[PDB]
Write a protein that binds this ligand. Structure first.
Ligand code: L20
Length: 273
């Protein structure tokens, strides 16, 4: 009985991911998000440890959902005749990174450093749990405005982490690496790093660097806003045309621009409150 266990609120959004409603856990008034996904619209199917056919996101969220708060938590899930229903964490107040950047324009590098660091930690946590997100972008990052903490959402395009090639991609085109565009194949970590490069650019420039496939393939980064030489270098490094020329997570976090990051709470008090 999910209809009586959660008090359904307003529809927050809908699209290829399905339909996401605002919710309240009747048990303790905990703010939740209720996600509906039709079985026909499900591309990747997964298997629970107890052996049960289920949406891949459920499998992935289970592997990542622990104490760490850089990833959104799967609280529960139900199966309906023609759909699955996911119950998720909901911060409040909240705003995603896309709306935040849209509203504020390009971010100050101190703020972008904090946000980007937190994303890196979240992505690093996912890969540790054997999970690849495959659609890292502002729109899939929630900001806990009160705590200054960022959270990864939407693992519906994700996959089990592996060391061999991926030949399928269902993330956003303009966030996809040139090797996907050219060869329809990529590797997990190097492709994630590319999208992280796209993400960082968007934070400090207020917009995406590449619009068309030809721009992605060319890999020429033009900066439309004032950005420090350190940050430009890190961005151009993440956006190296050859995957093996891109930095590891460790190299990104050891980068000179990545130093002296603010704490999430400091971030909130300075940039959010
Ligand atoms: C608002 C919220 N709180 N917790 C969660 C968890 C998961 C989602 C979520 C799940 N699946 C897909 C999602 O899509 C995010 C974007 N790709 C699309 C989007 C843009 N604006 C909204 C508003 C509400 C839902 C989705 C989107 C998010 C949202 C929330």
């Amino acid at each position: 009985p999910l209809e009586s266990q959660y008090q359904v609120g307003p529809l927050l959004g809908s699209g290829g991911f399905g339909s996401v409603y605002s919710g309240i856990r009747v048990s303790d008034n905990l703010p939740v998000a209720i996600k509906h996904v039709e079985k026909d619209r499900i591309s990747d199917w997964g298997e629970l440890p107890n052996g049960t056919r289920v949406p891949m996101e459920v499998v992935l969220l289970k592997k990542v959902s622990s104490g760490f708060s850089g990833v959104i938590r799967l609280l529960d899930w139900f199966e309906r005749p023609d759909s699955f229903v996911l119950i998720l964490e909901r911060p409040e107040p909240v705003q995603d990174l896309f709306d935040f950047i849209t509203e504020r324009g390009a971010l100050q590098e101190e703020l972008a450093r904090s946000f980007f660091w937190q994303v890196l930690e979240a992505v690093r946590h996912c890969h540790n749990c054997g999970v690849l997100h495959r659609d890292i972008k502002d729109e899939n990052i929630l900001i806990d405005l009160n705590r200054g903490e960022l959270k990864l959402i939407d693992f519906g395009s994700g996959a089990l982490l592996k060391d061999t090639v991926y030949t399928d991609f269902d993330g956003t085109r303009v966030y996809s690496p040139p090797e996907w565009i050219r060869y329809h194949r990529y590797h997990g970590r190097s492709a994630a790093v590319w999208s992280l490069g796209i993400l960082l650019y968007d934070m400090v420039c207020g917009d995406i660097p590449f619009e068309h496939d030809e721009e992605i393939i060319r890999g020429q980064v033009f900066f439309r806003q004032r950005v420090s030489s350190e940050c430009q270098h890190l961005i151009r490094w993440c956006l190296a045309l050859r995957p093996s020329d891109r930095p590891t997570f460790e190299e990104i976090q050891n980068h000179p621009w990545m130093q002296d990051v603010l704490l999430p709470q400091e971030t909130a008090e300075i940039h959010l409150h």
